[PDB]
């Protein structure tokens, strides 16, 4: 009806059955080979895990349960005054495989608003963190400290059937998603507003809107930005560091809190979630190296020299994406209908027309197209969100949606310990000989 | 004058060359397949990564740089009036591939003494944690917050050359290893000793003994147990959840504190490290519902009630080991020397004769044999460390040695971001149909 | 030595040349159409005039000589122990197109101190006005009567060259700006403080602080509010009623006093500046017929009663803005810093969440978002300035800055008499039929 748990309960047997038969008939099918190079190259090209909530096509980009981002923009419920998709409705889609109705989304906003609550020990810890503790470290530590609230951990300690793991993973994941904006906003306010009162949860407002209120922003357009941002950074299949971390840690039956916190330690990695910032610091420098205004000739020229110094243009390229990221596209659409005459945004666009043709001619790109992180920084900066070290925290809150939707499914489907076999160089040489 | 950083400096270029040559000749060589079953079954027997410090043979158990546990028990230096191997020396071995001298180990003990010091914010955080936040959570949280002290994070922001990454990891790894007993003991004292403050570092003591001093123990044989415990838990190849988590998070260039804290979130999972706590809960439960010395048919009953309830027997089974874990045997060796008659040990021994024939007949176990977690807890209990909820913290402290040894090498060898491909069931069903 | 008149002298010939060249090449270029609907609908979206000092983007809001409000908040000089931008500096920017130095602003503050002095006839007139003559009327009347002091009127009678018009406008504009707080404060004291005479000018204070001193306020944060208030109200392009009135009247070569006094007659219209008074009347009314903190459905009721009575919601909608006014957001920023919990502010915030979804569904609003007038009044009320009928006077004092900055330029550039063609309905019906 409206209760998401009940809808999910109904789906799991079906999906259990679908997989049982699949594996019966096709369990022994070879889907891929493993080379020495792949073992050294971070499992690049390896089909390593089943992840249900989203799949990243090299060419077309991310699909959430089959739906492209444009399709989500159209089908997923919006706020009443709204153009952008609510993350509530995305989460529903990932969980159910089905586009929610307005009522179902309405229901979920209120579910989340009611679960939004921090215990004193976490509030205290955050309030006591020094200012030189990075926001992703505060988030990670705080979510870890939240596992004192874990239903799944408690229930497992008391013994419980394997068949029932998913129900308590569901309640914990719902609690954590609920609480995350409270943690993330306490960190912002503590760091960047001298500790002012994060403020209330409006039980009739959507999750993003309570978040932007708690951050201390009001522009409806910033709330619309946050709706889109939380929606599109939600999931990116199972192989990205943060998603994989959550899956790997979760497979040992660590609870959602621990699984998510580990994922945030992955997201905090420069090669993962700290790119949005690298981009902005690179854009910033660039506009102060060839002036604010720059013609397509002199910009093209900067890019070629950049590349000749043995240096890459940040926010371009990807591990798996082989074409323009639809997450970039949608941010660009937002930019050009909302802040087309922003200086920093003009540069980002100017690179959009010039950088792809370069890189191609250089050859060493594989993906000469932009990723999400090429665009996200300038948008946040435009609305007043100038504190760049905090940007990944927004990415984190978003990613909880995807990784926790899947965590619920992993445990419902009885996925086991993730535990591959390793080899040393010495050993791998010997194996090769024999 | 001994300096492990200088030995590393020599060794790294040699291994870089070798791996370059090896990949030159064998990079394209197939070393295995991927099946559907593997993808659904947590990558079981998929050869997913290179990990240098230790390798697990299914048949023979763990080797550390080629050396068995028995070999390490004989070859590795010891404390002067001691019999068990110093964990310092194992770390040396893991890092260099060379058995250390007495002098090298002495140096390492002194090095970890000197870098042992906690910042006041971490002190503050630990002192304020509630008694119902699980020790592993306190540990992970505290280690995440230590990342404020990370030299790697700091240097990476400033654009440090990739050729320098390993030196920074080394420095952070040495610091964290040095600090770890400090954190672990404060958690112990705070939870279980009303926050006594006895806990200093003697600069002429080895790491294990300084640890047991801070825990408030005096028995020489507890210190020897601790030395062995920390040595044997140190590393178990790269495909275990904690090692793999560390590897994954560190491949994103997260610093050693973040990589270790995520590792601990994985180690805290019931199907991983937390099993050493769960074993003693399960033992306590069976003793309450039995005598202290039950018949073999009554043990079979208790085990059967566990298995028919959709629960696992803690400490039994393994993803890769296909016989008894040598870390189990070696702990058996210690008990039979030092506490052969202890009642809980007779039970543990008792279960060895019973549990494996069950499990085989239950069918849901490729391996019916015990792992290290089946045996650790009873040794601790004997010496008065009855706090079962603390047991995984000791495991965590030990497992730092292995994962950080490798992390140094991962960075030294330029291993890239770990990013496998995932598929959905729907996506997989279509891939097998084309 | 700073002198704004000398900077102007340099800048004017450059802009004259540029506009001559531009018209030479593009004078005949079509920039838009006129429709019947436009003619009936108060010229909505008809591009009717050149106005140099500020431009309103529908999407992004106001820019002052290219600079956004956030940019001005950062870049414009401030009082020493202050955070908000000095209106002196905005005037500088409007006039020169250049952000001023601290020194330039200091000079301007000193200049406006020195020219602050009212003639006794204006003193006489204000002192004799009855308490039921609206503050805006007193202001407009008093400014009309100041035209006795006009250097432009005097010089124009004597046949002064058209090349000298801008210098005279400059001198009169500087005098009027200097005098304005003097007039405004006498009105305030006479109406609401029994005619106390405290009101001197400190020659080393900025314009805003001298204003708040004469109003009888002492709170440092009221003075900061005043500085921000006067900065953000300063200019809103040339097509708003007050700016356009000033432009129209001044195109007839009426002097700055006459042009400003007519502007104020327009600013006093309910659908313009008087909205900032009407908002607080409407709030007072809703609080009387509600609690102090009503439900969302009870607010919707009150708004609906307003709209079904053929009345507008004050402070909502705009002819050109198609999102939230940044002058609204910036005032929200101030309140959340300084008075976040004030009851009337919660209401104002409350209405932000409600009013825009109504209005959209009512249909008679192209723009459902609030303007600056929705928010000004609650900030004033907080500091004790409860006299809602006075509120548009502050707006008027601020809007002098923009309209007089432009007037200087209009005259400098030789803009002619504004004289469009009108038609009757009958005449229009026949024009569309041929």
Curated annotation (Swiss-Prot), chains A, B, C:
Key enzyme of the Krebs tricarboxylic acid cycle which catalyzes the synthesis of citrate from acetyl coenzyme A and oxaloacetate. The modification N6-succinyllysine is found at residues 28, 47, 74, 164, 292, 298, 346, 364, 421, 430. The lineage of its organism: Eukaryota, Metazoa, Chordata, Craniata, Vertebrata. Citrate synthase is found in nearly all cells capable of oxidative metabolism. This is Citrate synthase, mitochondrial. Belongs to the citrate synthase family. The modification N6-acetyllysine is found at residues 47, 292, 298, 346, 353, 364, 430. NCBIfam families: cit_synth_euk, PRK09569.1.
